[PDB]
């Protein structure tokens, strides 16, 4: 269990989202989407959700797990739409 701040693309607010240290960036994005998609952001089926570190913009591979991302607890992450 690890806390991160979700800054979902096209949303208007950053939110607290608990992920698991074993989660994949894909699974992280899924947990973040739950709080933005179909609440304040329209789904985009023709796109893929990617996880980026907010402070420096580091793009994390889809398959990398939280445990290997070197994140600070509560770290803010951008969840963006990519191809």
Q: How far is the CB of 63 from other proteins (least distance, A)?
A: 25
Sole residue written with tokens 């699974």: 27
Beta carbon nearer to other proteins, 14 or 64: 14
Each residue 19-58 as x (binds other proteins by CB under 8 A) or -, in order, gives: ---------------xx--xxxxx-----------xx---
Q: Does 12 bind other proteins (CB under 8 A)?
A: yes
**CA 68 to CA 66: how far, in whole Å?**
5
Stretch that binds other proteins, among 7-15, 22-30, 44-52, 61-69 (CB under 8 A): 7-15
Q: Which residue has the tokens 């607890």?
A: 73
Rounded Cα–Cα distance for residues 57 and 40 (Å): 23
Q: Which stretch binds other proteins (CB under 8 A): 20-28, 44-52, 57-65, 66-74?
A: 66-74
Structure tokens at 23: 């989660």
Other CB atoms within 10 Å distance of the CB of residue 80: 17
């Amino acid at each position: 269990t690890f806390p991160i701040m979700s800054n979902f693309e096209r949303d208007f607010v950053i939110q607290l989202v608990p992920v698991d240290t074993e989660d994949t960036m894909d699974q992280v994005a899924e947990k973040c989407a739950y709080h933005s998609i179909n609440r304040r952001v329209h789904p985009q089926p023709e796109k893929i959700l990617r996880v980026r570190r907010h402070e420096d913009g580091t793009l994390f591979p889809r398959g990398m797990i939280v445990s290997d991302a070197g994140l600070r607890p509560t770290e803010t992450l951008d969840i963006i739409f990519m191809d």
